Amino acid sequence: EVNSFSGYLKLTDNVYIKNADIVEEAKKVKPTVVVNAANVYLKHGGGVAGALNKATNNAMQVESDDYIATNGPLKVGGSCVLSGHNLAKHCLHVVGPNVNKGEDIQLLKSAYENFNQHEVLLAPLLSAGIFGADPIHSLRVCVDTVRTNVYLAVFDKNLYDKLVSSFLE
Numbered sequence: 124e125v126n127s128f129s130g131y132l133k134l135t136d137n138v139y140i141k142n143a144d145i146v147e148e149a150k151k152v153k154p155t156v157v158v159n160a161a162n163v164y165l166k167h168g169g170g171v172a173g174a175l176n177k178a179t180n181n182a183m184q185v186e187s188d189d190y191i192a193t194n195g196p197l198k199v200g201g202s203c204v205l206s207g208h209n210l211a212k213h214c215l216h217v218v219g220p221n222v223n224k225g226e227d228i229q230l231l232k233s234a235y236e237n238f239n240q241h242e243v244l245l246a247p248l249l250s251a252g253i254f255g256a257d258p259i260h261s262l263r264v265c266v267d268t269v270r271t272n273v274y275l276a277v278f279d280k281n282l283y284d285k286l287v288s289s290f291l292e
């Protein structure tokens with residue numbers, strides 16, 4: 124079956140959320156698009172990007188280095204479409220701002236706007252974790268910006284509960 128997402132909670136007509144590891148979701152669902160929480164040089168050294176790359180047995184990193192050689196780095200707020208490998212048909216590498224490294228939080232709207240070029244996506248919560256954005260703010264920007272169908276996988280039950288409670292206020 125195609126895009127067989129299971130156990131998500133529907134927040135709006137186009138945003139769904141689950142307490143799950145995005146890697147495990149991608150292996151099970153094999154969505155049309157999986158979003159990577161990338162950096163501008165597509166160096167998948169840890170966190171979500173390192174976990175997605177390891178699940179491809181480093182094929183994503185080799186492909187990413189070849190893309191950077193020919194095209195140069197992305198911009199913060201920008202994206203590129205590369206292979207999904209064994210995880211999806213495509214991987215949309217999206218650069219959210221890293222607030223802990225001084226980048227502008229307003230670029231989070233530009234980052235989520237990349238999602239609107241794809242009908243259905245499996246994605247992480249952009250700029251959360253060690254990128255330093257307030258995760259409740261990142262969910263509000265996602266809900267206000269994305270118009271296509273997005274399935275958010277958040278791998279932390281404590282944060283999942285805080286995000287759902289924050290949305291349902």
Ligand SMILES: CC(C)[C@H](Nc1ncnc2[nH]c(-c3ccnc(OCCN(C)C)c3)cc12)c1ccc2c(c1)S(=O)(=O)CCC2
Binds near residue numbers: 160250
């Ligand atoms: C907020 C947090 C809960 C969330 N984390 C995650 N959200 C969704 N899916 C996730 N998988 C993993 C993961 C990390 C290590 N190893 C893994 O797999 C190893 C076991 N397998 C072999 C069974 C999976 C983490 C993760 C998240 C959201 C956005 C960002 C980050 C973190 S960040 O990486 O800190 C910076 C970039 C933006």
